[PDB]
Amino acid sequence: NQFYSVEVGDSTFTVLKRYQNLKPIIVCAAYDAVLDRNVAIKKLSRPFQNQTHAKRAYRELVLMKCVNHKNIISLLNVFTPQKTLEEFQDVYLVMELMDANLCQVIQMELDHERMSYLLYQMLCGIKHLHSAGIIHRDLKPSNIVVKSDCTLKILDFGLARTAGTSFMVTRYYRAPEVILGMGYKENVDIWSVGCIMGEMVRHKILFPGRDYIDQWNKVIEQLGTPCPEFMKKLQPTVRNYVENRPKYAGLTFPKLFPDSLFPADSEHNKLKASQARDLLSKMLVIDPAKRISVDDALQHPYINVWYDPAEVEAPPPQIYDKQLDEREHTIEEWKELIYKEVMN
Numbered sequence: 001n002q003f004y005s006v007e008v009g010d011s012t013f014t015v016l017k018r019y020q021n022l023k024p025i026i027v028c029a030a031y032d033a034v035l036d037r038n039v040a041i042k043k044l045s046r047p048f049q050n051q052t053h054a055k056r057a058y059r060e061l062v063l064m065k066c067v068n069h070k071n072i073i074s075l076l077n078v079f080t081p082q083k084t085l086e087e088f089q090d091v092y093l094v095m096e097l098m099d100a101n102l103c104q105v106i107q108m109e110l111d112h113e114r115m116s117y118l119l120y121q122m123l124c125g126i127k128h129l130h131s132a133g134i135i136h137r138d139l140k141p142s143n144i145v146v147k148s149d150c151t152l153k154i155l156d157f158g159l160a161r162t163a164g165t166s167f168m169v170t171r172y173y174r175a176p177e178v179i180l181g182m183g184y185k186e187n188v189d190i191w192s193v194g195c196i197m198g199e200m201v202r203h204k205i206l207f208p209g210r211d212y213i214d215q216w217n218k219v220i221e222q223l224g225t226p227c228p229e230f231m232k233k234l235q236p237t238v239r240n241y242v243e244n245r246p247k248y249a250g251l252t253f254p255k256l257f258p259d260s261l262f263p264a265d266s267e268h269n270k271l272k273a274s275q276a277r278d279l280l281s282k283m284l285v286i287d288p289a290k291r292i293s294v295d296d297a298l299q300h301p302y303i304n305v306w307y308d309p310a311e312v313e314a315p316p317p318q319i320y321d322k323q324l325d326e327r328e329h330t331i332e333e334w335k336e337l338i339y340k341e342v343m344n
């Protein structure tokens with residue numbers, strides 16, 4: 001038998017014998033005896049509960065294989081313990097083992113070298129995805145991982161374009177045009193980056209709330225009521241609720257992100273506080289027509305210190321299935337497509 005089973009964190013992992021000493025991080029850490037290095041193993045158990053699960057799994061598999069960028073998690077191995085298509089049930093993804101999730105990194109005291117470097121790498125990864133027509137729309141700290149040396153990888157790719165701005169849990173990083181069903185462009189992801197950056201400074205979620213209604217209130221209370229230039233791009237119906245909200249001037253960026261939150265008492269620190277706030281003021285913009293692009297954010301003085309064309313300006317991923325986002329299939333058909341990807 002090529003496999004063995006172990007209970008980890010109250011789930012069954014049936015894995016190739018090369019993977020040893022499984023530990024909870026449905027994901028675990030393992031030691032790979034063949035490569036002599038640690039790995040993360042993710043079990044896809046219920047990827048055929050339905051078509052949404054199946055599409056997500058297939059898309060996750062195909063994209064993780066095809067994309068090769070240092071800021072996007074890459075696949076080391078894929079396997080199934082089952083021997084035939086008929087018995088096929090579980091899919092295991094094996095990837096490089098990182099040290100922490102960005103959620104835990106956000107909690108550390110703000111350091112400009114680290115924050116700028118993390119943001120730079122996020123921007124690099126997003127740029128690469130965008131070049132291949134991959135616009136994430138649900139970027140969040142829990143799906144970004146880091147190593148102890150601050151190298152960063154994005155864990156996921158968001159939904160197919162055919163999902164638009166619908167996601168049918170953590171909603172706090174979604175852009176206004178997503179929340180309000182306005183349609184999106186590449187810079188939808190820049191809002192999420194802004195939310196993450198802001199949280200690195202405040203150590204509090206910027207726009208929390210039990211639902212979108214609550215979240216929209218937190219947006220307008222802090223950034224102000226959006227302009228008629230924005231209101232006019234809304235459908236009439238949605239606009240009524242948004243127009244009938246209490247008017248807010250919004251707080252200035254110096255009040256949202258006061259000097260008190262930033263390292264003090266050097267001219268370098270004073271400079272960086274100002275630059276960090278400036279970049280925030282350009283990312284946390286409600287109207288996506290007025291919000292900074294990824295490419296312009298990489299030129300911003302806060303970020304551009306890291307800029308290396310050899311990292312930033314890689315060729316785009318060419319995608320083999322041109323209808324990856326659009327085509328729909330039965331469960332039986334998705335299951336076979338996935339199975340083929342797993343067996344190659």
Ligand SMILES: Cc1nc[nH]c1-c1ccnc(Nc2ccc(N3CCOCC3)cc2)c1
Pocket residue numbers: 025027040042095096097098099100101104145155
């Ligand atoms: C595929 C996948 N899905 C979610 N996460 C991952 C993943 C992928 C690769 N590496 C890691 N490394 C990692 C290791 C330890 C931690 N923690 C530290 C302390 O306890 C809280 C978390 C976080 C991440 C995680």
Ligand SMILES: CCCCCCCCCCCC[N+](C)(C)CCCS(=O)(=O)O
Pocket residue numbers: 163164165166179180181182183184212213216238
């Ligand atoms: C806090 C209030 C929440 C209001 C929820 C608003 C409901 C939005 C539904 C209208 C859809 C309009 N179109 C343009 C057809 C969507 C394009 C596709 S997509 O935007 O990319 O999904």
Ligand SMILES: [Cl-]
Pocket residue numbers: 002016017018019
């Ligand atoms: Cl093995």
